[PDB]
Amino acid sequence: RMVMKLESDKTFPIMLEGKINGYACVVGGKLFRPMHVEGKIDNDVLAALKTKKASKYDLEYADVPQNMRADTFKYTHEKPQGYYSWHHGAVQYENGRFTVPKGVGAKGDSGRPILDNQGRVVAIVLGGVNEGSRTALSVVMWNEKGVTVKYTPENCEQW
Amino acid sequence: RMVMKLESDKTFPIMLEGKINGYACVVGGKLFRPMHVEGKIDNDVLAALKTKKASKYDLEYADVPQNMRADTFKYTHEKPQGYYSWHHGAVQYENGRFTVPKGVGAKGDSGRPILDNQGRVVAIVLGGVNEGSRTALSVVMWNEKGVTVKYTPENCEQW
Amino acid sequence: YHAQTFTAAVSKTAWTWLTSLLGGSAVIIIIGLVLATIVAMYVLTNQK
């Protein structure tokens, strides 16, 4: 069940001195890479792309080539309450916030697209923090009008 | 199998160089053929029929004689999401765009009509651009007001 | 006993004809451009 959402080769790792510190994901014909993650994408064709920064929303976007547009994630403007699928495990949406079990998400777990129960991306998580006894994720989603609203919990911890 | 048996003889190839280079279709009482196809219609009565140029929409349209108005394709203004019948195979309408699997469609296939599962024409193609694993189509369809919106992807290869 | 200019003896009525013909030349062009822009916007709005 949960294993039917990890066969997505369209995600790409970021290499820094042979180590992993982040993931660059392609959605809707555009490649998104977290800004705070330093390194180079393993794929040469995507690495050669020149990206335009966006400091406020904390990610850089680039336009993928025509031949790569076919195999790409699909975004969703609706985020119904409740269950969601992620590579690390289940995630749960309550009151506009994504939450995960304890210890899920750490150094090198940013840029991960949070898939839906249908099998298409609804948002991209850039970091998570655990306040009190609950863990929340800083994540950028997409509104119905397409304004790319970002929700970030207070005192957010990177990655 | 299910997509190929939807065969209609209303389409007519255009003959020049003694080879097939495109198809012209009679829809709703009008004969449509693209710019890029040269030659005469196989049907002599339509071959001798005068055509009016519409270069910016890329289709010559001709008024069919009143006798032949009885047997013609039925135009459609609604485009529900999902797969549609075609001469070759299923064509997916997604995100307001018609797409076909890899390799399907090449030169000499321009002008063929995309129908629906009901059995009536919903659009007609003029060219196709290969986006990778899935190929997008340059196609013109019909709206509820009959404004004839034309969808032409970027740098589309002309069939 | 004086000095003349190139526009000295045009007189008001010749000014009227020259302005109406040249101004009317520009007015119809402006109308054409306005109509072209309006129909271009209308066509772009017709795109679904």
UniProtKB/Swiss-Prot annotation, chains A, B:
Localization terms from the record: Virion; Host cytoplasm; Host cell membrane; Host nucleus
Catalytic residues in the record: 36 (charge relay system), 58 (charge relay system), 110 (charge relay system)
PTM entry text: Phosphorylated on serine and threonine residues.
Domain notes: The very N-terminus plays a role in the particle assembly process. The N-terminus also contains a nuclear localization signal and a supraphysiological nuclear export signal (supraNES), which is an unusually strong NES that mediates host CRM1 binding in the absence of RanGTP and thus can bind CRM1, not only in the nucleus, but also in the cytoplasm. The C-terminus functions as a protease during translation to cleave itself from the translating structural polyprotein.
Domain Peptidase S3: 10-159
Site (Involved in dimerization of the capsid protein): 84, 117
Quaternary structure annotation from Swiss-Prot or TrEMBL: Homodimer. Homomultimer. Interacts with host karyopherin KPNA4; this interaction allows the nuclear import of the viral capsid protein. Interacts with spike glycoprotein E2. Interacts with host IRAK1; the interaction leads to inhibition of IRAK1-dependent signaling. Part of a tetrameric complex composed of host CRM1, host importin alpha/beta dimer and the viral capsid; this complex blocks the receptor-mediated transport through the nuclear pore. Interacts with host phosphatase PPP1CA; this interaction dephosphorylates the capsid protein, which increases its ability to bind to the viral genome.
Its job: Forms an icosahedral capsid with a T=4 symmetry composed of 240 copies of the capsid protein surrounded by a lipid membrane through which penetrate 80 spikes composed of trimers of E1-E2 heterodimers. The capsid protein binds to the viral RNA genome at a site adjacent to a ribosome binding site for viral genome translation following genome release. Possesses a protease activity that results in its autocatalytic cleavage from the nascent structural protein.
Domain of life per record: Viruses
Modified residues (Phosphothreonine): 11
UniProt-annotated stretches for the region Ribosome-binding: 1-10
Source lineage: Viruses, Riboviria, Orthornavirae, Kitrinoviricota, Alsuviricetes
Phosphoserine: residues bearing it: 8
Protein name: Capsid protein
